[PDB]
Amino acid sequence: VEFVKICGVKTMDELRLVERYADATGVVVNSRSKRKVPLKTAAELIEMAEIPIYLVSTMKTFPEWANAVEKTGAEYIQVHSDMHPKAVNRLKDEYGVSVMKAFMVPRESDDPAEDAERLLELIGQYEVDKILLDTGVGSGRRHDYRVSAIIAKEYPIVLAGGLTPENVGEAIRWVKPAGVDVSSGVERNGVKDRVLIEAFMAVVRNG
Ligand code: NA
Ligand code: NA
Structure with missing residues (x-):
């Protein structure tokens, strides 16, 4: 029914841990992230993966990608x-990659419906397989x-x-x-952790 x-x-x-639970995973490259790995290391993980594994990056230009x-x-x-x-x-046509496009949730301003219309317009510019909404922190989270x-x-x-x-x-x-999509919420000391993932999944696994 869903997607984790x-x-x-x-x-x-x-x-190998996340593959027991999740429908997809991701390896971060060329980004500002505690989870960044070098391209070669990403390559090795990508080679062994049994589920979809996303190459996750904040890379901005096509050649970088x-x-x-x-x-x-x-x-x-x-x-x-x-x-x-x-x-x-271009990346899709030339390399056969499937894309999940991440969008920052805009907070400014000030009625949620207005930012949603600004975001809907933005989303509709893209032709991509999946859309990911990256929510923020603080009270602006609701x-x-x-x-x-x-x-x-x-x-x-x-x-x-979050x-x-x-x-x-x-x-x-x-x-x-x-x-x-979950990253640090299922990490014990920065490591993907089984009981946390199961606890996370336990909440998901109801439909
Ligand atoms: Na293990
Ligand atoms: Na188990």
């Missing part, structure tokens, strides 16, 4: 930058949930940012997204 991604694996151990895809043999990419729809399509809830009615989105076993349940029947 566990993002930001850095080792084979972490990867083209080169990363070439070195990793990624079949999936998560585009976590405002890269032009045409550049995305605003992000409402924005995301509007969006999730027009597209089967993947809800992301999800934990303790808050994902609320997140889900608030936004009712098609999927959820």
Whole structure:
């Protein structure tokens, strides 16, 4: 019925773990991230993966992406930058990658419906396999949930940012997204952790 991604694996151990639970995972490259790995290391993880594994990056220009895809043999990419729809399509046509495009939830301003219309317009510029909404922190988070809830009615989105076993349940029947993306919420000491993932999954696994 749904889609769970566990993002930001850095080792084979972490990867084989998430594959027991998640519908997809991700390896971060060329980004500002505690989870960044070098391209070669990403390549090795991508080679052994049994589920979809996204090449996750904030890379902004096509050659950067083209080169990363070439070195990793990624079949999936998560585009976590405002890269032009045409550049995305180029990567799709020239490399056969499937794309999840990440969108920051805009907070400014000030009614959730207005940011949602600004985001819907932005989303509709893209021709991509999946849409990921990256929610933020602070009290502005409930605003992000409402924005995301509007969006999730027009597209089967993947809800992301700040999800934990303790808050994902609320997140889900608030936004009712098609999927959820989790990274640090299932890490014990920066390592993908089984009991946390199971606890996270236990909340998801109800429909
Ligand atoms: Na293990
Ligand atoms: Na088990």
